[PDB]
Write a protein that binds this ligand. Sequence first.
Ligand SMILES: [Cu+2]
Ligand SMILES: [Cu+2]
Lengths: 655, 655
Amino acid sequence: PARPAHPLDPLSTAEIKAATNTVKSYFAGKKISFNTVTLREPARKAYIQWKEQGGPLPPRLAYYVILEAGKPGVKEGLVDLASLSVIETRALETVQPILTVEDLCSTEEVIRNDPAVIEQCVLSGIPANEMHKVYCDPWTIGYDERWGTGKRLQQALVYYRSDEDDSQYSHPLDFCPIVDTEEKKVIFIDIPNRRRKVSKHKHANFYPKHMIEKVGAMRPEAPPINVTQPEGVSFKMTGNVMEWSNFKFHIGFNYREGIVLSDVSYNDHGNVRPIFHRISLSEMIVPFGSPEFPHQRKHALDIGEYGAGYMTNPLSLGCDCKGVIHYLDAHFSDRAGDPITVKNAVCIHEEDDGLLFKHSDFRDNFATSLVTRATKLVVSQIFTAANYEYCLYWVFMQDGAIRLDIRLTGILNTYILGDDEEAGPWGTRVYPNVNAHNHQHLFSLRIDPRIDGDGNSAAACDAKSSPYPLGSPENMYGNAFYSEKTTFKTVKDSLTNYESATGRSWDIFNPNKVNPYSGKPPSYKLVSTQCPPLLAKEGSLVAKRAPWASHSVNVVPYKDNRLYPSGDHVPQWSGDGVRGMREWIGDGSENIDNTDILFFHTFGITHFPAPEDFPLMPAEPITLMLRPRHFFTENPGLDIQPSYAMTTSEAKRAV
Amino acid sequence: PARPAHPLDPLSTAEIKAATNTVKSYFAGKKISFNTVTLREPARKAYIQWKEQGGPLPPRLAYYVILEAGKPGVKEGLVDLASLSVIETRALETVQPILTVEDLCSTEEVIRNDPAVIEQCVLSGIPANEMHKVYCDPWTIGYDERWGTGKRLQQALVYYRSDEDDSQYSHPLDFCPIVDTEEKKVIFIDIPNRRRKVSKHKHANFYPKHMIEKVGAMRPEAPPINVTQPEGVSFKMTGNVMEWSNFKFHIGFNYREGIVLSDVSYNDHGNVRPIFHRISLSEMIVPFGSPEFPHQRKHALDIGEYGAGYMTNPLSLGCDCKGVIHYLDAHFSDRAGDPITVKNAVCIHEEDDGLLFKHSDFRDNFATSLVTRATKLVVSQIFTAANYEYCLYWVFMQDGAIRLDIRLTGILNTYILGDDEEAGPWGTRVYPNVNAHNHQHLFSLRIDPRIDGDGNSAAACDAKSSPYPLGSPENMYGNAFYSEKTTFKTVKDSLTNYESATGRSWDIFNPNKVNPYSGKPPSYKLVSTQCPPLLAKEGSLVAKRAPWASHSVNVVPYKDNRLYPSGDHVPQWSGDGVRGMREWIGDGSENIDNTDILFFHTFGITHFPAPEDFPLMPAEPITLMLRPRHFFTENPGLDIQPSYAMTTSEAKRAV
Ligand SMILES: [Cu+2]
Ligand SMILES: [Cu+2]
């Protein structure tokens, strides 16, 4: 296959086909299916040597995961695309892989045709001949101690639609079928002691026709707000390489993490300085808070169990991206080994972002004034996880900061509620017979830094009052306060949480350099306040399967392929064993001071449903920022043309 | 004077003149000057009775504060505009009032002509004949135990400009002159033991001409991003009354708080429901963290000591407000009693605000999809406090939420640093010989609620794991968690801080009503995470003068005229005495459950300067939100026309 323009470019449709042909040949005579075919990124050192030391172009490699009929677990390996050959291979019989759309799409039909399920629907008030009205969201079983990884399983959250255009979530059923993904059959059904028959209320719908019927009618179409860029955009893309306002980086994408930003640098007036080698979301977990069976199985690790790439929405229609947009397509492999494409998976564009800075002199009644507007570069994707939608926006700003904005929307996860049943403290009755369980949305931001070069460290920064008392010579009026910086020496030191008591922030810096003015090392500071503590207790399935979620920050030594904190194959893992973040942390004694490190940050929200979130939920914002502190010697955006500028002398001159 | 169209409208230029003529006559033969002439808002009950019970139009009243030559303190009172007469008056001899632009503008010239100051400049390396190059930011003295309120004082932070177009902040001097505001003379100069002569480095400038000289040249003008509304805006204003996306409220404005939003309601499909009777910023404090003399005097309470109204920038030029804007002018009185106008003090406009909500069905590859874009209504002002600029944005959203966004910009407060001097832990060397001291920016949001009517309460909501252990029948898998709501019964109960350990939020609700679905009282939830603890210690000048800053939340009984938490006349108050928030809290035993309450919220940031903030600082964001929870029975924006919408049946039909 033809080599890509960039070593970090995702596998092309041709490379994917070449890789699968190679694997099929290697396993000739075997009945195999493809689960994953993706780029195996080049080693960090090899990439940097190629990029800055005239080193050789790294080998183009493809990582694959396959299933073989009648064989337990999976088989994984690497294909050297240049020589069209398998160079690495191994069987993992006790693990289960990410669930693809194809793996999930057949589950609904299997439960509809299962006698045991049909009987439960009849028992629930739905005639056996109306099974076409029964729907279900196919979920990873998460983890069920009754089967471990012995069988590839899915659990089905069952719903009912009186009409195909209904939003089924107002009508969940009370039972949960367990499906054998391979054999495509229901092997068990969890049935509650308390039986709740299907709700007889109207469905809570949200399309215009439904609303016109529910409320008087729709609001009149509002006056349009048009945004146009007659002279084009200021950003320039060369393949997947982006160049904008001094920032330069590679926009990658894969089936799991979705958008992956690499080789991020900033051109500081000719001095191209590295910032991050790689940044992305490496994992997620949405732990629900109802202790009742079988709701403990609701703690989906969406990224590792379904894939932010696989679940991504084509942004073309919908009008998700307003303005002059630039799109990127994503390419994956289907079960048969054929390339599949999701068009407009990533949208890129620039928008006005308010004021960058401003200052006026009161001396001449603000006649002396300088105002510069801000513009931001947005790289976005939106993926759907059954009922929820996650809108991800990677934002680059003209002050050199990088921000990650997430907007949660879609529909609340719902379970049935008896007329007399109290949604108790575990959930909210958002509609008659509808219980929306409490849950958290936690994400694992993975940062591979290269702050102004190689050799980095991390630290926690806490604001604190001077220890000297009020009235002492050292703090006479008791107003003294400073920033206590605690640099992490070993992995154990980094396991820290956000603390409101100190307005804690974290620094990722280069101890080998110093700011000529402040005398502090150049750094990028993580300013993140939406850092919920993990509510599930220690030893819980949730805490064990997402060891990274226990702390807001985890810093470990860099190692190639240390990407996914909950392990490479997440579905059905019990959480027992040294893998993922648990393995990287080890005994916690490894050095992370002035070396190659990986910074994993846990952030998110805790959601206690309210009627306002139903039947469709208004977007809920989540944001974190990485800003330069002591990185530059002065405001880096001062050479940007001001929107307005009047000097004191120019003001006098205007008589 | 002619009566206003609305009882809450600010005083017109005519009412102001009528009020001052009345006061001048009352004090005939006395040499008085006007400090404040503003609207004395009608009693809460009277206003509500007028608005909803056909009650009489409240009396149009004007509150005034005057100074009399040779008399200590001030005189304040009320003028009944209808009868053009003083109906209330009293002398406050031991207090000092807010500092007006006129009070402040003469200070610079007095220090330039003071022999003692001139000598200090010469001693500092500046020739006596170059005093026109010496500048100073006139500050309230804050509080100096050497004079108390016995004399009206100002302190001058001295700077030097080699050229009038320079930004003086790179060149502060080491001494601090104390000025008698009335006598217009320097009565003392604080001189440090360590002498630092003026910096000989170039000034750190930021205008284009300066940048062209500092760096190669300016960046090319970037491609324009145009925003237009060909069919107009969707909001409708009738005087100061705003109507937008079901929201209805009065946009007021005064010399102190700046923007004041009143009588806020939401039209819930014909049912006009009250939300807030009044919301605004009632006070601020920017406490600096250097314990060294005389830096303890740097803890300006900008709102109460200068006025967010008095300091507001005309938004006309500058291009601060992009798009189709609607402006409001502000009117105050000058020292002579004549109305003064600041045009375009408040700008109003609507903007796109991303997605309001979205959901697609994976079953037909997202063909079934509904997308609705969000639009926000922004009411903004920008005021200048000497070196800093505060950009305030009150934002109304289509999900019924109200947000307050603040962007800090302008220039860092700076003090001189010796070549050999360590900015120590109290500040940062952001430029040669420049020390930018640590400081916090704290604000007091004042909320007078009327959540779905009269009779309100407040509570803290903390996320917590179930108390039952992992493995118990009640929490078998240890994932259970709930929201612990603690309703405040007495004032003392409300004194609470944000807690990251529980992701604490606060509810302002109506215990007299219940949501038909959830069974919870209707409420608006305060979601605020930028809540720094007050770093100054108990008993410090800072803590004593801003008793409200000690807690993130303070809830006290409503009383007419309980507006300013640090007292009505803030300058030079020692912090000793029962006034403001200290008086309202009392012994903390008063009831605040199901009654008329006032909710004061302290939020802001802690600032540790870095070179990136100099010589001009990039905007730093601060935000808090008030969102409806259990207020509505479903997403209130569902009747808004979707940007895109395709039904499952419509998707099938498209073959
Ligand atoms: Cu949620
Ligand atoms: Cu600041």
